[PDB]
Each structure stands twice: as structure tokens, then as C-alpha cells.
Paper text:
The polymerase is a multifunctional enzyme that is responsible for transcribing the viral negative sense RNA genome to generate polyadenylated mRNAs with a 5′ methylguanosine cap and replicating it to generate new viral genomes. Here we report a conserved allosteric inhibitory site identified on the L polymerase proteins of RSV and HMPV that can be targeted by a dual-specificity, non-nucleoside inhibitor, termed [name]-1. Functional analyses indicate that [name]-1 inhibits conformational changes necessary for the polymerase to engage in RNA synthesis initiation and to transition into an elongation mode.
Ltrunc-P was readily amenable to addition of the [name]-1 ligand and a co-complex structure was solved at a resolution of 2.39 Å. Density corresponding to [name]-1 was identified in a pocket located within the PRNTase domain and formed by the conserved motifs B, D, and E. Phe1385 (motif E) undergoes a rotamer change to accommodate the fluorophenyl group of [name]-1 and make an edge-face pi interaction. The side chain of His1338 (motif D) also rotates nearly 90˚ to accommodate [name]-1. At the other end, the fluorophenyl group of [name]-1 sits in a hydrophobic pocket created by Ile1241, Ile1368, and Thr1365.
Numbering used by the authors:
A (entry chain C): 130 to 186
B (entry chain D): 130 to 184
C (entry chain E): 131 to 155, 174 to 199
D (entry chain B): 130 to 228
E (entry chain A): 11 to 133, 184 to 617, 629 to 658, 691 to 1460
Write the structure that this text describes.
Amino acid sequence: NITARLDRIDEKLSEILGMLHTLVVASAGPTSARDGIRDAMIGLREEMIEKIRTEAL
Amino acid sequence: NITARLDRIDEKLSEILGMLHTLVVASAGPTSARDGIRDAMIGLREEMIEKIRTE
Amino acid sequence: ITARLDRIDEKLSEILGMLHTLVVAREEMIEKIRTEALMTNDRLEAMARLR
Amino acid sequence: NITARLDRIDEKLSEILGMLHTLVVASAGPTSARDGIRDAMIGLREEMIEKIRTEALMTNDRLEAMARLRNEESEKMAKDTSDEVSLNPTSEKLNNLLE
Amino acid sequence: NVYLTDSYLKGVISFSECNALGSYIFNGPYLKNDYTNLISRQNPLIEHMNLKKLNITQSLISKYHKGEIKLEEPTYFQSLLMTYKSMTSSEQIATTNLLKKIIRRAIEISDVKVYAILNKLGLTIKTTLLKKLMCSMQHPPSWLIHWFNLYTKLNNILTQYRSNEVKNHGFTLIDNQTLSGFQFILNQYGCIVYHKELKRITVTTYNQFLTWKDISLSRLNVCLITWISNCLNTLNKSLGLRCGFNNVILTQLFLYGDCILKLFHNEGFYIIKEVEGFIMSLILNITEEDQFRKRFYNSMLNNITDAANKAQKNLLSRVCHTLLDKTVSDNIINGRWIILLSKFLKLIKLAGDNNLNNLSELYFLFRIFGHPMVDERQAMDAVKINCNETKFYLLSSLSMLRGAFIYRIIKGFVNNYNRWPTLRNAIVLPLRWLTYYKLNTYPSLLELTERDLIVLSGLRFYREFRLPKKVDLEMIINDKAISPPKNLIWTSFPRNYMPSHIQNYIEHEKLKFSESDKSRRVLEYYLRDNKFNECDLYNCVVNQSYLNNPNHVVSLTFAMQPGMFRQVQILAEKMIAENILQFFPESYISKCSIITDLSKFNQAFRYETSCICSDVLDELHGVQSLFSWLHLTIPHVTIICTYRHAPPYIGDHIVDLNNVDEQSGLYRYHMGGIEGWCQKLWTIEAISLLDLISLKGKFSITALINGDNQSIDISKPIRLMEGQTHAQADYLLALNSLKLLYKEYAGIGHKLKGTETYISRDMQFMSKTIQHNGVYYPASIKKVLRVGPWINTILDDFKVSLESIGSLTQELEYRGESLLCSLIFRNVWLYNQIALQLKNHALCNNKLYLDILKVLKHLKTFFNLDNIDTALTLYMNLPMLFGGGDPNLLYRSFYRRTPDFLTEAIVHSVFILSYYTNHDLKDKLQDLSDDRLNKFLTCIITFDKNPNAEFVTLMRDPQALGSERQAKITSEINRLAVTEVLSTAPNKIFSKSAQHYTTTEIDLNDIMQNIEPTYPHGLRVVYESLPFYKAEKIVNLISGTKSITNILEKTSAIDLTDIDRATEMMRKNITLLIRILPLDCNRDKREILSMENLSITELSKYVRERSWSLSNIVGVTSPSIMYTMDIKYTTSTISSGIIIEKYNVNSLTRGERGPTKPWVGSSTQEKKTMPVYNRQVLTKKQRDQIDLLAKLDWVYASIDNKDEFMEELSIGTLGLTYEKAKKLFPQYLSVNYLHRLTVSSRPCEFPASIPAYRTTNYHFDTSPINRILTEKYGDEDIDIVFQNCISFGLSLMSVVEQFTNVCPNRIILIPKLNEIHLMKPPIFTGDVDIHKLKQVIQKQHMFLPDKISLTQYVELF
Ligand SMILES: COc1cc(C(=O)NNC(=O)c2cc(C(C)(C)N)cc(-c3ccc(F)cc3)n2)ccc1OC1CC1
């Protein structure tokens, strides 16, 4: 029982994560790119961090 | 164990609380709650270079 | 375990507060970028040590 | 106590998945003055089926929009998927001349 | 500087151009009361002023103002022209007589090939078949004379204009005699037709006249094909095409469609466009059960009649305020047109004859009525609404789409890379899923749940693929145009149509743009970039400099944008094509099919529905926004119609078009998907949606997306109740799945439409290709409508035109399955371009024709022919390789591919010459009293040696002959001019390449010089491994344009040096047969080559080697299956040969199916071991640079210099050093590269000249020839393609039934062993010139691929 109800809490709290993620991805769109906010919402990635390093050298 | 599942929840439940701050701060504003998401990203880049050239 | 569940509930009742402020309408926002960006950076400098 | 404290967390997990399985998002688009873009607008279902009805969010084919957001089948949608398709009055004339 | 105008429609009939010209000429809105009727008359174009100022038109204008002539619409005069039956004793007798001659001549030319084929198979006109066909085609029917006369008159108005405009510029043809009653003022800037007897005038454009000429040509072709085919089928029912049309019905069809376009003006094409629909129904009524066809029929009648009602609405709304106001018939207002329609459609169903062949071929109808004058501003207004509309999604609908996409990516990774993609988020999954991460396995669709798809949508990936760091110039360069930057968009409109403040604003805005921004074309855009560097695209996608870029516009003309964004668009499509389409290979058991058209489907997409799946590809490539570029950038730009004559109205002192107020043909806030752009992203999102629907509805969706047609297939295992039939169950499943499809598409912003979607039980019209019961019903006639004099050429090149006539005309054989109908139609249109239209060349008036006449005198004396007429029958039969006129070698009637073209050309010449020499092709070559074949072969093998640049030439065409023994081609002719214009390009990447081009082909020639046995295909591989292969792909492209010299000159004029180069090329190519075949005793060989015990493939070997002097050339030479195999129809004591058997039970197997599996002739694979490492770490332009270097490891391992060879060749290209690189090379287990090398220059497959379905009727046994080819060559690789023997036998099965009206029970192919030789892998002696190998790499370094770097090799493992 206990250690099996947390399985349900886990499986549902994962679905909440999927919801709220797809909502961040879709909510960072034409008007975020316009305002220079999309990268703060989807987060920096490899090819841009590589450039920041090469600048660090 | 029930501590390997009560610790997966707190880290899964902190993802949710970080994806709710993004949405609320983007939506809330603009022009003074978004100008600050750009200045603070200038800060992110210019302080990421400072932690890296010293390692 | 009681403390763990209490802490889970106290955060799940604070998710709702934000999840209501969302359907009505930065420091915490800009600490999740820097952290993940730093993790993928330190994962990029694992490939730079093998070279 | 750990079957009660655990059940109060399982009730906030059904109303966070009720408030999230209910949200409707309006695609970003031109403003009403149509001088600029307005963000993607997220809101509860029912509060989204009145903003279409109020024409607060400019949308064409508003009745189809309200009907589809509601778990409901409209007339044009029922017309377009019906088992039998009905000839328009002039296509009955044409069909009579082809016979 | 000369201007050569189009001879065919290559472009669009502009509504705006016709409206502007006619509105200026007649001082009132001509077609539409828009802004291209106002500015046209306030400030007219000089080209329009010149047309109006003519004395002819100044009188028609005056008549019109006095009311004596009625202004009409170009479709009215299309109807008048097309039904022009004007006759005399001097026009219907001088057109009947010319047609009778063309037909007789084409049959007489075809006779020699027919003789050759019947002689080989063993079955002025020698063949009684074409002797019977001649007594039948003696009198052309009046319907055919009608279109032949009309086409001749229209065409030789066009020729008279084209030649006269080449001769002097500004020419306006004023012609009132060619067509009696009509009076043309034709010009490249307009066509004014005046009909006196009726008192009517139309103004139109040069393209609309081209279209009229095309209609007359197309109807002439339909009638020609049909009436050749009906005569053939009166002789043998299996000798002509599959269709059986009656041509009085067909001409009535033409006239009633013309009447429809006469009542309905331009709008009438709406109605004609629904013809497809109607034909579809007539097919469905044969193939479907009641409910499917009844539903399609009803929706189709609704579609046609809503098209008609919309046509009337738009016609009366458009014509109301124009000069055409009283040109609307009373049959439109009073609804009588419905009868005309009823008669049109009722004729179509009569042309179809309830026969699926007629119906499928009847699709040529959709192309035979011309083209509409498409309104550019209105087509944008129809799209503004669908793209500004707000969309409402359930957050759960977006999560499920994202998750179903992420599931495809996880599934594809596990299937390819044996792994899950590296997750940034593993803490997001539950235990049930996080246990799928560690086991690197996935659940199937059956175990998958919609909660699973919601949870997957939270996963974020780490980079798995990498951006190419240096631009691929082969993907960013093409012949098409480029939108100016935003501030220069007003340069896309004539200076007269723009207000003064815009003219003198754009004279100052040019002084602050680079010559590349002002370029106006893609090629010019890059060639003029003096600050170009290979890493500028890559830096943009990383810095995201394409966001909020003030130079962004979309210009509709087909959409286009400045170069800096077109770059990103192409890169984003390319990364999906390379890295991501691997995961999406689609790019009672109640079954069903649902067909949807996705043409508008891009319009409904938004950022919220596109970039949730496109954001997963951003993470995989480690980029931000590359795949999301469209919906993040285009909402902020203005979409404008930038067609020349359709300017926007610009308010005073507005210079920026973001400030220009919206109007017709100019708007803003376009959310949702300019089409073409991101077409690949939307395809894989659509397939993800299909996978989500399959989950929601519990059926097994198979899918197939090709362009704008998505062909879903659905299955759902059920067990049906009592009284419910299979058909009822399938219909119910279709209706249910259609409901679900609709709901789920609507869930994401997409509202399907009953018109564009339909349901079938069996996969109809899947590829615009009616397959029914496995049998294939072609639209062959549709492919051949525009076969004519100067098709598909540049500067009217006589040889390319012949090539395209011949290529297009075997669609009547490969798909139509008529050898002889393809032959006769080919020869009609070949004889016409050689004997009739050659003296009319626009640039070379009769030069080419005088050359043909002297080439024919030569042929007459060489083969001692009795006439110069019988010398043209021969010139048009012998191959084009020897400077002849035959574009289709006789081997292509039996198999489509060969490794050795020279052997096929020589065998063709032998077979053709047999007609005059009466050799028997079944019997062995023999001595005969006349030596014309001996003389031909001797002149072929005996000739002066003049090898030059042997190796650089065998590299870029491993089948080149050399010693001027074959006709040159435009690429070689124009290469030295392309490089001399490129040497002056401001962009140094092309400048330095072109400056070193001659030296690099000098040393690229020295590299492989000293390798004693020559393998031209290995030479090809060496060539492709080097950066010159890519350097001269850009040269080969630029040398296909017209006016190579002016590429950087900003004109559409062809330079006179280019004219002279093309003229010399053509005249040399025509006269080649005189040099290849000299009369002078065949080079003092008073003893001619002997034919006893001769092998043609050894002769071809010798000719190729001699042509270069090369002692040995290995690889290329291969026998001819046509020559090699002797055809038998019974099994005698010999018991040898391939056996082809008919497995059907019915004598005629055309348009049937059989038990056998289809014969795709696939090459036995290249057996290799792929090593273990991380493929995805290398870009695709690194992965095939390894497979090339590995192929060289394979082919040239035996050269004395190999260690240095692949050391310098591996460091130069890859950057690794041949021991770090040997690790990645696939290791070939195949001993023989001669047999197994796969390279650009070698056929990948060996199909028959037979539609695939028909191969399924015959069973082939190669057993008896493996017994003979084994006990003689053991198990060594021999030199005869195995596939092509089977292809030959299979096609032979068809061709025999064509000419006999019976399929043979079996045919045995017995080979000529003489023709078969050993092919064993040589040992390559000699070194490579390693200092020359580095010279190529160094002088062509700018086209080198990306180096496998150091942070990229350690993680290859
Ligand atoms: C794909 O490019 C090529 C392929 C081939 C090819 O396939 N060579 N063929 C055999 O090596 C072979 C070997 C044997 C043995 C091993 C003795 N039993 C038998 C037969 C064979 C054939 C027909 C029959 F009816 C029966 C048996 N063929 C040849 C040349 C090619 O292109 C290069 C010239 C440019």
C-alpha cells in the first residue's frame, strides 16, 4: 500500500510536468522572440554555451 | 524504499514549481517584467564567462 | 515520513497558488537557466578533457 | 495518519490535473486594433468559451469554436461527417439533367 | 545583346499584366477595377505606350470609342480561335498536303526500326505492318486537320515574331493574314487580337498567346496520339494504346469546355478545375461499393455546383464596374448555363466509356483548356483570413501532440542508435517510464496510453546531432530569384508604377546596401558577396541573427524572402531531411482509407502547434530556434504581392512597408506557415498526429504523405454482428475514423473540409496514379501534350530538343505500353523539327539546315543511297552518339539502363543498317556482297588518335570516348566561359576556385596517370573524394543558364558570344557524322574490317581504348543484351539460355496481374562490415566522405603508394590521419569492385521497359545459363549484367504480344559467348602523384568538407 500510493502520486505528478512543460514551450513564441525572452524560457543549449566558452578563451 | 520515492517526488515537485515561475513571470508585465528578463540574461551570459575562464 | 508528506502537501498547495495566478494573468526563473546551462556546460567540458 | 495525510495530497493532485486538463490556450495573433501581436492567452475552458462569445478574442466561425471547445458536435461538423451527404438545390438540378 | 523569347509557356499568364495593358489602352477598367487599372493609365509603362501608339491599334481604339467594336475577355477569343474553321483551296489544301507528308515520312522513318525489331525477334515501306498502317492514315480526319492547321498558323505567327525580335529589338508583329479574320498585334509585352467580322477586341499578354499556341499544340497532340493509336488498334488490338477514344466526342469536349470558359470569363477555370473530381467519381463508380461512391458522387456534384455558383458570383462582382460590364451572357443571369455544364460533363462520361483506361487517361483534359489569368492580390486576400485567425487549443491537445512526437523520436533513436536520446530531464519520468530509459526500450502503440503521451511531453533532450559548420554551397545556390531586403522591396515594381517619393527614396536606399543585397537573384546574390565566408550561415543559426531582423519581408509572386533568411529556411529543412526523417519513414478486420489534401494545411499551423514538436528538434541539434524560425519571425514582417504590375498603393511620404497601410495584396500579422517553408516539419507533426489518432481511436493507421496528399490507411479488428456485411463494416469504420480525424485535427487549429477530404475502401488515386487490383492505369497522354519543336532547350539547342522529344515520347511505351505508337509519334515530331522547323531557327536561320543537308549528302554517298530523302530516314535512325538523329537507342525499348552506352550505340547502328544491308540479326555476322556495315565498323575502329586530358575527362564522365569521337555537350563547351566569368566574381570563394580551375584540372589529371590499368569508375570515386567535384558542380550549374556572360551584367539579353558558341556547338554536332564516317576509303583502309568471328563488345573495348590510346580500360565495357541474346520460342536439344515463361492463363497479359513478385532489377549489394561508433556525431557531409575514402581503400589497396595515398587523402579531406580514420572506414568483404562498386556513374538498378505490375506475369529461370557460364568461367565474375538479361526477357515478352496479339508461352534467350568475357579485379601498378594529389586539395580548399575535429573524434569512440 504505502510505497504503492506514492507510485500514483509519481505517475500523476509526472503528467502535471508534461502539461506545464508543453505550456512553457507553447507560451514562448512569436512575442517572446520579439521581446528577447524566449531563451530565458527554453534555456540555453549546446551551440550557444560553446560560443560562450570560446568567448571565455 | 519509501525514501527513494519521497525524494523523487520532491525533485519532480520542484520541476513543477520552476515551470510555474517561468510562465507567471513571462505573462506578468510587460516592458518592466520582460526588460528584466533580458538584462538578467545579459548577466547570465557575462557571469557564465566569468565562472569559466577561472576553472 | 509524516514530515515528508507534510512538505509535499505544503508545496502542492503552493503550486495551486501559482497555477491560479497563471489562469488569471524572476530570480527563481533565472536560477533554473543558470543551473541547467551550467550542467550542460560542465557536460561540454567533459568532452574537452578527453581531447 | 499516513493514510489521511497521504489522501489530502491525492486530492490536490486531482484538482491540479483538473485545472490543467481544462485550460484552453488561444494562439498568439494580431491585436483588435491589429497593430501588433498579443501573447498566447491561457485561460480556463468556460472563461474561454465566453471570451469567444463576447467577441473579446476576435475569431471567425465563432459558433464552431464554442461547439468544439465544448465536448459537443455542431451542425456543420455533423453535416461534413454524416453517413449520407445531401445535395444542394442547384446540384439537384444538375443531377436531374445528368439523368 | 539579343533577346530570345519563350516558345512555350514557362511561367504564368498574369491577370495584373493583362489588366494594366488593356486598361491603359481602352481608358477604363478592363478586367478588374483595382489599383492595377489606375496607375496603369496615370503613368503607363513605355512598353504599353509603344503598343498603343501603333497605327494599327490607334484605329482599333478609335473604332472602339465610336462603339463599332465590342471589347471582350481573352477566353472569348480563346473560344473563337479554337473553333476557327476557315478554309479555302489554298489553306485546307496546303495543310492537308503537309500533314499527309508528315505522316508518310514518320511511318517511313519508323519502318526501319520496326524492320530491325521484327528481324531480331524473328516475327519505302518494307514491313507489311506499316504498309497496312499507311493505307489507313492516308487521309487525316477533319478534326485533326483542324488543330494541325490552327497550330501551324499560331506557331508560325510565334516563329515570325521570335526570329524578327532576335534580328532587331522592339519588334511588334502586326499580322492580319496568317489567320483569316483575326488580326494580331503580337509582342512580348502584349497581344491585341481584333476580329472584324464579329467586331471584337481583346487585349492580353504574350504568355496568353503562348498558352493559346500550347492549347492548339496539345489538342493536336491528343488527336495525333488518338488517331495513330486507333489505326494501330484497327490493325492489332494490342498494338496501340490501352485507351480507345472517339475523336468527334473529344473535339466536342474541347468545344464545350471552350463554351464554358466563354460564358464564365477567367472564372470559368474554377469549373474546369472540378473536372478532376467528376472523373474521379466515374472511376469510383466502377471500383467502389455503393456507400463510398454514392457519398463521393454527391460531394462531387456539390463541389462542381458550388464552383459554378462561386464563379457566377465572382464574375458578376468583378465585371460590374469594368469595361466588360455588358459582356456577361444572359445564360449566366437566367441560370441556363446549368444545361451547358450538364452537356459538358455528360460528354466526359461519354469519352470515358465506363472504361478505366479511357477514364484514367482522360486526365489530360485538366490541362487542355489553357491556364487561368491568376489574380495575385485576390489569392493573397483569400489567405490573409486563414492566417490571422485565432486558434483555441486544449492544453491537453498540445501536450499529446508534443508527446506523440517525442515518442517517435525515442522510438527512432532506439531503433537506429540502439539507445534512448540523452535526456536532460530523466527525473520527470515515472518508474514505469524511467525503467524504459535504462533498458533502452520503448512500449508499443498498443501498450501506450494517452497519459504516457502527456508525461513524455515533459522530456527535454541533450544535443544528439550537430550543425554543419561550413555552408554547403550546392544547397544554397540555384537559378531562381531572390526577394530584395525590405527597404528595397519597392525595386520589384516598375519605376512608373511607384510615386515620386518612393523612386527618389530607393535611389538613396541603394547607396547603403551591398551589391549582394541589391542582387535580385540567388546566384548573383552569392557571386557578388565580397565578404562571404563559409561560417556565416552557422554563426547566424547560433547567434539567432534572423530574429527581429529589420530586413525581413515575404514577397509573393510562390513566396520568397531575402537571402539571409532563405539560408536559414533551407538549412532548417535540410537538417530535418538528414537527421530527423529517419524516424518518420512514412514521408473481421475492417479496413478503410481516408485521403486528405494538405495544401492549405500549412495555413492552419501556428507557433503553439508547430514549435512544440519543432522545439524538440532544436534540442537535438543543440540550437535555439532554428527549426522554429518561421512562426517566430514571419508574424513581424509584411506579406506583400511583389508581382511587377500589381504594386500597392503607397500613401504620401510612406517609404517603409511596415508603415504602409494594409490593402489588397499587402497585409501584416501573418501567423501560420508560408507554404513550402517548413514543409518537412509539418509532415512529421502530421504523422505524429496520425499516431495520436491511432491511439485515441484504437485502429492501426498506416500513412503515406507525398506532397499535398496524405493517404491514410486504417484497420481495426472487429467481429461483425448478424446482418452486417464487410462493406457495411468498412463504411462504418471509415465514417467513425473520419469523425475522429476531424475532431483531432480541429483540436489543433485545423478545420478539415468535406471537399478536400474523402474516404475510400481501397487506396484510390494514391499518387495521381490509378492503380486498381494491382493493375496500373496510366495518364501517359497527359505527359506528352507539349511535345513539339524546341522543347526543353536553352537557346533552341537542336540536340537537347531531340533528346526531350525522344525522352517524353517513350512515356507512351514505358507507361502507355505501346512501342509502335511511341515510335510513330516520336518520328512525327522529330521529322518536324529536322525537316520542317530546322530552317526556321531563331538564332541560326538556316545554317543548321544547310549543315543537315550536307550531312545527308555525305550519308547518301557513304552508304550509296538513292535519295537525300532515304538519307534522312537513315540519319534519324542511327544513334546520337555518332552524331546521328536517333535520341532513343533501340535497347531502351527493352530495358531502361545499361552500363556501356557505346556498345548499345554500335549494336543500334548494326541493327539499323541491316535494313539497307539486309543482314539477319538472328544469324551470326557474316560476309555479304555489300560492305556497308563493314565500312561503318571500319570507320568506327579506324581513326586518328588524339587523346587529350584523358584522366580528368574519364573522371567526370567515366563513359567519355575521347579523340573527338563523340558529340560534345553544353557543360564542356561553356565551362571555360563559366570559369572566366567566375574569375571576376567579387566573392573570393568562387573567384579563386575559377582562377585555379584550369591548373587544378591539369594536376587532377596527373594524380591517377601512372596506374597502368584504368578503372574509370574508380577514377570517378577518386574525383568525388576531392574538393574539385564540388567546385565544378557550381560550374556545371552556371553553364546550364542562358547568357553565361551576362550573369553579372543585370540583363536578360543573351550575349552574342554565347550565341556564337552555341551556334558552333550545334553545327559541329550536326556535322559530326561526316567526321566520324569519312568517305576517304575509310582512312586509306582499302581492306575493310572483317565481320567473321567479330565480337561487338571487343570492338567497343578497342574503340574506347584507342580513343584515349590507353592500353587498358577495365570496368566500363559490357555486352549488349539485345545483341548478346538470340531469341527462341521453343526448347530444342540445346537446353540452354534464360527461360522466360508466362504464368497467366490468358493469351493477352497487357493490363493484367500475375502471381509473380514484381521485378525491380536491384543491384546485388556492396557487402561490407560497418564498424561500431557514434554515427550521429558526424554530419552527413562527413559520413559519405568516409564511405568514399573507404571505397578507395577498397579499389586501390594494391597501388604501390597506398599508405601515402590514403594518408595524404585522409588528412587533406577528413583531417584525421589514416589510422584514426581507418577505424571508421567500412571494411569491404566483396573481392570484386568491378562488379560491386556503387558510385554516381553506375546504374543503381536495372528495370525493364515494362510497367512494374506487368512483370508479375512472367517467371524467369536463369538456371541453364549458370551451368554454361560456370563450367567455363567457374565462379569468377564475368562481364554481362545479370539483371539486364532478365529485364530484356521480361520486356521481350510484352513487345512480342504487341506485334503478334499473343503473348508467347515462353521465350528462351541463348547468349553469344563470344560477347561474354572475364571481369576479374586487376592489380593496380604504379604510384599516385602525391604532390599533385595535394595540389588539388590545396587549390580547391574552399570546397573541402568539414574536418572531423578533436572534440568530435574522442566522442566517436
Ligand atoms: C552491376 O554492374 C555490373 C554487373 C555485372 C554482373 O552482374 N556480372 N555477372 C556476373 O558476374 C555473373 C557471374 C556468373 C558466374 C559466377 C560465372 N556463375 C554468372 C552470371 C550470369 C549472368 C547471366 C545469367 F543469365 C546467368 C548467370 N553472371 C557485370 C558488369 C557490371 O557493370 C560493369 C561493366 C561495368
